[PDB]
Structure 1
Amino acid sequence: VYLDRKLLTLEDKELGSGNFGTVKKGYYQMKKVVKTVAVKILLKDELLAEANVMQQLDNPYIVRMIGICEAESWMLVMEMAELGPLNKYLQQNRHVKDKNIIELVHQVSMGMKYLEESNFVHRDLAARNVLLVTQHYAKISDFGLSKALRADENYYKAQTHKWPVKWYAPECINYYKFSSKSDVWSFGVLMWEAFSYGQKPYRGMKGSEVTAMLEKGERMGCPAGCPREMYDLMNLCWTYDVENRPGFAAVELRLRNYYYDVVNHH
């Protein structure tokens, strides 16, 4: 959990930045090998809560935390996913095949099926928060808004609203209620982003105009080259009523079966 700063070597140039601070590449000295790491460098309570969520998770499709370090700044040290965010990768590699996109979004659904089984809500599931280990291996990152659900409740109730509204289900916006089914809605938006090679969803629209569009029963169109089966799955994730929206066990199964059909056709 608490890492030794003497064993961490940070690179000078950052990989990326945000309002939180920076993400830098580093190296952590192990009992024998060196481990390449991604380090989120800073607020403190939020980073510690994010670290506490990551320490409880154990799944091949979720970013693994090595530990935290309290040195010049507070640091969250994670296993490195070298290829970076999925949205940026697809913007820069617009000839990635449709079968490969299905493979990656199916990996995300497996990580989310595990989070749902673990009763954690992600609350920020978007293509910018998926990282690539390789072109054929995605991991979910960014547990800063994540919550462990109480034993007696199926949702987390936020007290007041900095929210990624274009990824949020109607019950999040209207009742401040976040469940695994709310993450399924975000997963539908993530699928649209991935099949659109990292394009932003609801292009040119304000959050209130997105709410108005969804309330009229309107949904984003089918991205170019996206198979009908995958657009149908996106629309099922965007089921307005939480009760009738599928959970990640059903979503992952649909994706798994379609992925095997495409692997067979190829």
Structure 2
Amino acid sequence: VYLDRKLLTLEDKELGFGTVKKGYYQMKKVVKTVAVKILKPALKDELLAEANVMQQLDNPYIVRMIGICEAESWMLVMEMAELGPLNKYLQQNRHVTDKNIIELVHQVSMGMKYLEESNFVHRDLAARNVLLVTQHYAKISDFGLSKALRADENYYKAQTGKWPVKWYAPECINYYKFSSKSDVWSFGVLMWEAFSYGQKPYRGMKGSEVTAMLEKGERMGCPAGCPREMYDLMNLCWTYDVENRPGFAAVELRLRNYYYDVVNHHHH
């Protein structure tokens, strides 16, 4: 996992803990374009824990880590997803079709089905953390809050924090318990963001007002032009009771089947 600084070439400009910069890494033969997270002891430990999670994952729909390097600061080197975050892409590309959005959120569900099978919880699943390789190829990124589940438990219990509350399930807020089912709830919010072309969820509401709304059984409305089948899936992800909420195997299957029905309608 330890990379050679002499083989890494960093660009001066910043793409976006610190910063994300574009670079190039000399591989065995080819040169590879990379995205590098550069830190600007708690930050070092967090980056190394993130590196430890990514090291264990191998799936076409999850950003691959190339390695780590300790130079000017600690650096986490990843494969580059040229088109950037999904929310920003859709805000700038409103012509993207409903079929293309289904294709991308289905890819995220495949990556998450893999993470669930791997017994890792993401804990920051949102459209800003889905990166586009192409307009037809999404990858999940940003494993800074992710956790490997213990062998005897299907959830992570947080003790302390600065949380993305609008993407969190009720049991995360009420019991500090994070599971693959909690990530399913976040995935419902991510689907809403995607079909709303990168609009922020729960516009104009405080985190506490969001909790109050959800407790009353109320949910965000259907985005303009969103297929009813996809809005129904969002509502199923937003099942209040964790036991009754589907896991990613059930979600990916529903998305897969619907995507094939849409691919069929297009051919007709």
**TM-score where L is the length of structure 1:** 0.98
Q: C-alpha separation between the residues in 1 aligned to 2:160 and 2:241? A: 22
Q: C-alpha separation between the residues in 2 aligned to 1:155 and 1:147? A: 9
Q: C-alpha separation between the residues in 2 aligned to 1:197 and 1:95? A: 10
The RMSD of aligned alpha carbons is 0.9
Q: C-alpha separation between the residues in 1 aligned to 2:62 and 2:149? A: 18
Q: C-alpha separation between the residues in 1 aligned to 2:27 and 2:153? A: 40
Structure 1 ranges of 4+ moved more than 4 A: none
Q: C-alpha separation between the residues in 1 aligned to 2:72 and 2:136? A: 36
Q: Percent identity between the aligned chains?
A: 99
Question: Deviation of residue 160 (structure 1)?
Answer: 1.5
Question: Deviation of residue 216 (structure 1)?
Answer: 0.5
Question: Deviation of residue 234 (structure 1)?
Answer: 0.0
Q: Residue by residue, what CA displacement relative to the aligned partner does 1:184-221 show, whole Å, maximum 9, x if unpaired?
A: 00000000000000000000000000000001100000
Aligned to 1:62: 62
Q: Residue by residue, what CA displacement relative to the aligned partner does 1:55-86 show, whole Å, maximum 9, x if unpaired?
A: 00000000000000000011000000100000
Q: Residue by residue, what CA displacement relative to the aligned partner does 1:142-190 show, whole Å, maximum 9, x if unpaired?
A: 0000000000000000001310000000000000000000000000000
Q: C-alpha separation between the residues in 1 aligned to 2:136 and 2:148? A: 29
Aligned to 2:217: 217
Q: C-alpha separation between the residues in 2 aligned to 1:227 and 1:4? A: 49
Question: Deviation of residue 124 (structure 1)?
Answer: 0.2
Q: C-alpha separation between the residues in 1 aligned to 2:136 and 2:110? A: 14
Q: Residue by residue, what CA displacement relative to the aligned partner does 1:205-247 show, whole Å, maximum 9, x if unpaired?
A: 0000000000110000000000000000000000000000000
Aligned to 1:103: 103
Q: C-alpha separation between the residues in 2 aligned to 1:161 and 1:79? A: 29
Q: C-alpha separation between the residues in 2 aligned to 1:11 and 1:48? A: 23
Three-state SS of the structure 1 residue aligned to 2:68 is strand
Three-state SS of the structure 2 residue aligned to 1:174 is helix
Three-state SS of the structure 2 residue aligned to 1:23 is strand
Three-state SS of the structure 2 residue aligned to 1:244 is coil
Aligned to 2:207: 207
Q: Residue by residue, what CA displacement relative to the aligned partner does 1:74-132 show, whole Å, maximum 9, x if unpaired?
A: 10000001000000000000110000000000000000000000000000000000000
Q: C-alpha separation between the residues in 2 aligned to 1:31 and 1:100? A: 35
Three-state SS of the structure 1 residue aligned to 2:133 is strand
Q: C-alpha separation between the residues in 1 aligned to 2:195 and 2:125? A: 16
Q: C-alpha separation between the residues in 2 aligned to 1:11 and 1:173? A: 40
Question: Deviation of residue 44 (structure 1)?
Answer: 0.3
Q: Provide structure 1 residue ranges, at least 5 long, that are not aligned to the other structure.
A: none
Q: C-alpha separation between the residues in 1 aligned to 2:183 and 2:29? A: 40
Q: C-alpha separation between the residues in 2 aligned to 1:32 and 1:104? A: 31
Three-state SS of the structure 2 residue aligned to 1:224 is coil
Q: C-alpha separation between the residues in 1 aligned to 2:28 and 2:201? A: 45
Question: Deviation of residue 31 (structure 1)?
Answer: 1.8
Three-state SS of the structure 1 residue aligned to 2:243 is helix
Question: Deviation of residue 258 (structure 1)?
Answer: 0.1
Q: C-alpha separation between the residues in 1 aligned to 2:163 and 2:221? A: 24
Q: C-alpha separation between the residues in 2 aligned to 1:21 and 1:93? A: 28
Three-state SS of the structure 2 residue aligned to 1:145 is coil
How many positions carry a matched residue from both structures? 263
Q: C-alpha separation between the residues in 1 aligned to 2:108 and 2:155? A: 21
Matched, 1:23 2:16: no
Q: C-alpha separation between the residues in 2 aligned to 1:86 and 1:202? A: 18
Aligned to 1:76: 76
Q: C-alpha separation between the residues in 2 aligned to 1:97 and 1:229? A: 15
Q: Provide structure 2 residue ranges, at least 5 long, that are not aligned to the other structure.
A: none
Q: Residue by residue, what CA displacement relative to the aligned partner does 1:16-63 show, whole Å, maximum 9, x if unpaired?
A: xxx911000000011211000000000000000000000000000000
Q: C-alpha separation between the residues in 1 aligned to 2:74 and 2:221? A: 42
Q: C-alpha separation between the residues in 1 aligned to 2:55 and 2:251? A: 26
